[PDB]
Design a protein around this ligand. Structure first.
Ligand SMILES: NC(=O)N[C@@H](CC(=O)O)C(=O)O
Ligand SMILES: NC(=O)N[C@@H](CC(=O)O)C(=O)O
Ligand SMILES: [Zn+2]
Ligand SMILES: [Zn+2]
Ligand SMILES: [Zn+2]
Ligand SMILES: [Zn+2]
Lengths: 426, 424
C-alpha cells in the first residue's frame, strides 16, 4: 500500500524548516513537495508536526544474546522505534561476542527474524574482547559488520590497536574506540572531582579517557585509517580531537545526550541511575563538550543505550553496573534542554541524529530524499509530557531523567513503509 | 686572574661585537672593550669568539658500572674540549642513583675527579625497572638535577602520573625517554626506506610519539614541568606544538645528529649510525628544523653515548645504540646550520647556553659581571677535519669522521681554572 503525509513541517536540503507534504510508494519516498494529489493512496494528516528522517543511532546495546533479561532484540528495536530511530548499531559486548563466522551469522539471523528497525552490528576487534588476539576482519566484513570495536573495554596493547587500524584501513572500514587506560581507573565509580571528594568515593580521573584518544589518533594517522571516538566526556579529549582535525587526520567523535545535559554538579546523591562510563564530569568538561559540538569537533550525537534491570541498580553506587537507558529519552530531552534553550537550532539537532552519523560511516540513511528507502518519523513539538519509566517499551528502566517535563516526542515511526510504532492518540 | 683581550662575543642585545673580559677570584669582573689590569696574566685571542661555557642537559658518563666505555675523568675532559662547562649525567648506570647510598657515592666521584660541573639526574623508579618509585624528596636534597628513567620508557601510565604529581610539588622536572615497548618491533633502525632496503627490523615513529602525547596530558593534570628527550618524529613535534598553544609546561630538546642526519644519509649497515631514537625520514628531519625555528624545540643536547670500538664492530642488529657527541657538537652545528644560514650565531649559542639554563633554573650560560667564570674560546675561522683518533673521550663511535668543520673550541675555563686548551 501507499501513504500520503499532509500538512507537516520538514527540514529542506538548504537548511530551513518549511511546510510540505510527502508521498510514499512501495517502501520508498516517491515525492516531497507542497500540495500533492494522490488517489488510491491513504492520507495521514499530521497537524503541523515535524516529518523527520528516521533517526540514526551509532552506539547501542541490545544485550541479546547472553543478557536477554536486560534487553532483547525485539524490545530494544521496538523501544528504538518509539524514540524515532529507524537505524541502530548494536555493540559487541555480548555472550557470545561476535568474533567469528559462527557468532556473526547467528547474530545476523536474529536481526532478520525479530527486529522492528534496521540493525547494523559491530564486529569485535579482539576475540572475546580479551585483547590478546585479533578477529578475522575480512570474514566479519563479509557478514555485514558495521565497524570494529571492543566497546565495554579499551584496547590496552598499542601494537594491537595499530595492527587493527592497518587491517581496517585496507578494507575501507572504521575502528571505533571505547577509550579507557586501565591503570588510571583507580577503582572509580564516578568522576574524580567535587562529588567524589564530598561523598568520599574513589574517582575516575579525566586522563583515563584522554590518553587513549591521544595515543590512537597517532596510530590512526600512521595507518591512514578512519578512527571514531566513543562518547567523549573531557575538555582535554575535545582539544586533542580539535588538534587532530586541524592536521587533517581522519578522526570523528560522538557525544551522548546525558553528557550534553548533565555534569557532576547535577547529581543529587549516591544514585546508581547517575552512574555511567564515562562519568558525568566537571562544569568545564561539560562546557567544552557543548563548544565542541558547535565548532564541528564533535560530529554527532549517539545514545550509548545501556539497559539494566532495576534489581542490579537497586544496590549501592559502588557495586551497581555502569549505564543508563537512552532510546526513549533522546529527542525530547535534547529538544527541551538544548533547542528550546537556544544552545542549538532544531536543524542542528536533526542533523546530529540523522545525516551527520550517516555521512561519517557511509550510509544511505537519514535524509528525506526522493529515491531513498522510506525511513521516517513524526514528532510532536507542542505537547508537554513528563518522562515516565513505568511506560517504557524498553526493559531497561535505569534513567536519571524521571519527572523531567519535555516536549518533542515522536508520535509515529516508519521503517521502509511498514509502520513499526505509533503513540496512543493521532 | 686572566684578562682575555681582543675577542668577540654575543651581547645582551643580539649582535656580535668586540670586547675584553677580566676574570678574578673565579668570577667575571668586567665585560667592556679595552680593559687594563696591571697584575693579571694576559691572553690575546685575536678576534675569536668568547662564548659562555656550553650547557648539556643529556649526557652519559658510564661510571659507575661502565668504566670501559667512559669514566667521569675522561668524559668531562672530553666535555671541556667540546666547550661544555656544565653537563647533566643520566642515571642508567650500575648501580642506578635511585637512593641515598648510590646518589652520595655518585656525588663523591664527581667531586673527586670531574673536570667540569656535573649535575646528576635521579631515577624515577628503582633500578629503572618501573614498578617502585624513588624517594624524590631525598634525591632532591642530595642534589638531583631532575627525574628520569632514561634508557627506558615509563610503561605504567599511573606511575608516570604519580611521579609527575610528586615532582610538581617539589618544583622539579620529569624528563622522559619516550618509548612505547609494544611498538619497538625488535628494531635497530627507523622503519622506512633504509630498513626496507637492507631487510632489517625497524622502529616506527609512533613508538616515540604515543608516549609524548600521553605524558603531555598527564603533565597537564599534575601541573608539572615535563621535558621531552631527543625529539625525532614529525608527529612528536606536532603534539608538542599543540601542547604549548594550550599553555602546558612542556619543553623539548633535539640532538646535533638528528638535526644534521636522516635515513637517506646512512651509507650502509654501519653501527656508528645506530642510535635511539633512530635517524628517521626526510620529512621528520624537516619538522625538527621547523620546530627548532618556531620555538617548539627549546634546546640542543648531545646525548653523548660512548661505546667501545669492539662493541660497535658486532653488527647493526647486536651493537648498542648511541654515538659520542661532546667533541663534535659545536663544530657540526656551526658548519651545518650557521654557515648555511638555517639559524644565526646568536641562536646556536643560546640553544647550548641560556635556553637550557633558563628552562631548568640554573645560573649558567651567560657572560655577565658577577657570574662564575665558565667560559669557552671558539675559533670560527680555522677549518679542521673531525678525527676520532684525537678524541679524549673513550667513545670514538661517531659517523662524522672526515667531515671538515669550522667553529672549534681552543680553550675552556671552569670557575677561573683552565680545564683544557688546544695543545698544538
Ligand atoms: N554505557 C555504559 O555506561 N556502560 C557500557 C559499557 C561501557 O561503556 O564500558 C555498558 O554496556 O554497560
Ligand atoms: N641514545 C642512545 O642511542 N643510547 C643511550 C640510551 C638510549 O637512548 O637508549 C645509551 O645510553 O647508550
Ligand atoms: Zn563504552
Ligand atoms: Zn557503550
Ligand atoms: Zn634515551
Ligand atoms: Zn640518552
Amino acid at each position: 500500500m501507499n501513504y500520503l503525509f499532509k500538512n507537516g513541517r520538514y527540514m529542506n536540503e538548504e537548511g530551513k524548516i518549511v511546510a510540505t507534504d510527502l508521498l510514499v510508494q512501495d517502501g520508498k519516498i516517491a515525492k516531497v513537495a507542497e500540495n500533492i494529489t494522490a488517489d488510491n493512496a491513504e492520507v495521514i494528516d499530521v497537524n503541523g508536526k515535524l516529518i523527520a528522517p528516521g533517526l540514526v543511532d551509532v552506539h547501542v546495546h541490545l544485550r541479546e544474546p547472553g543478557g536477554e533479561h536486560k534487553e532483547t532484540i525485539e524490545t530494544g528495536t521496538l523501544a528504538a522505534a518509539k524514540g524515532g530511530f529507524t537505524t541502530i548499531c548494536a555493540m559487541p559486548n555480548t555472550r557470545p561476542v561476535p568474533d567469528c563466522r559462527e557468532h556473526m551469522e547467528d547474530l545476523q539471523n536474529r536481526i532478520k527474524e525479530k527486529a522492528h528497525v534496521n540493525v547494523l552490528p559491530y564486529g569485535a576487534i579482539t576475540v572475546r574482547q580479551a585483547g590478546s588476539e585479533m578477529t578475522d576482519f575480512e570474514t566479519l566484513k563479509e557478514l555485514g559488520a558495521f565497524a570494529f570495536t571492543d566497546d565495554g573495554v579499551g584496547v590496552q596493547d598499542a601494537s594491537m590497536m595499530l595492527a587493527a587500524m592497518k587491517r581496517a584501513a585496507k578494507l575501507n572500514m572504521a575502528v571505533v574506540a571505547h577509550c579507557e587506560e586501565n591503570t588510571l581507573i583507580n577503582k572509580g565509580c564516578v568522576h574524580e572531582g567535587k562529588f567524589s571528594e564530598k561523598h568520599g568515593l574513589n574517582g575516575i580521573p579525566s586522563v583515563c579517557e584522554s590518553v587513549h584518544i591521544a595515543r590512537d589518533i597517532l596510530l590512526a594517522e600512521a595507518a591512514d585509517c578512519h578512527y571514531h571516538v566513543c562518547h567523549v566526556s573531557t575538555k582535554g579529549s575535545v582539544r586533542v580531537i580539535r588538534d587532530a582535525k586541524r592536521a587533517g587526520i581522519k578522526v570523528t567523535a560522538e557525544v551522548t545526550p546525558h553528557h550534553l545535559v548533565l555534569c557532576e554538579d547535577d547529581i543529587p546523591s549516591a544514585d546508581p541511575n547517575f552512574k555511567m562510563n564515562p562519568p558525568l564530569r566537571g562544569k568545564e568538561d561539560h562546557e567544552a563538550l557543548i563548544e565542541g559540538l558547535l565548532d564541528g569537533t564533535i560530529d554527532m550525537i549517539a545514545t550509548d543505550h545501556a539497559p539494566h534491570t532495576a534489581e542490579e541498580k537497586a544496590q549501592g553506587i559502588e557495586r551497581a553496573p555502569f549505564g543508563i537507558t537512552g532510546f526513549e529519552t533522546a529527542f525530547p530531552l535534547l529538544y527541551t534542554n538544548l533547542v528550546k534553550k537556544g544552545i542549538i537550532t532544531l536543524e542542528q539537532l536533526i542533523q546530529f541524529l540523522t545525516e551527520k552519523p550517516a555521512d561519517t560511516f557511509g550510509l544511505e540513511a537519514g535524509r528525506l530524499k526522493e529515491g531513498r528507502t522510506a525511513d521516517i518519523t513524526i514528532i510532536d513539538l507542542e505537547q508537554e509530557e513528563e518522562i515516565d519509566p513505568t511506560t517504557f517499551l524498553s526493559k531497561g528502566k535505569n534513567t536519571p531523567f524521571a519527572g523531567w517535563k519535555c516536549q518533542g516526542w515522536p508520535v509515529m515511526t516508519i521503517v521502509g513503509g511498514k509502520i513499526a510504532w505509533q503513540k496512543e492518540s493521532a
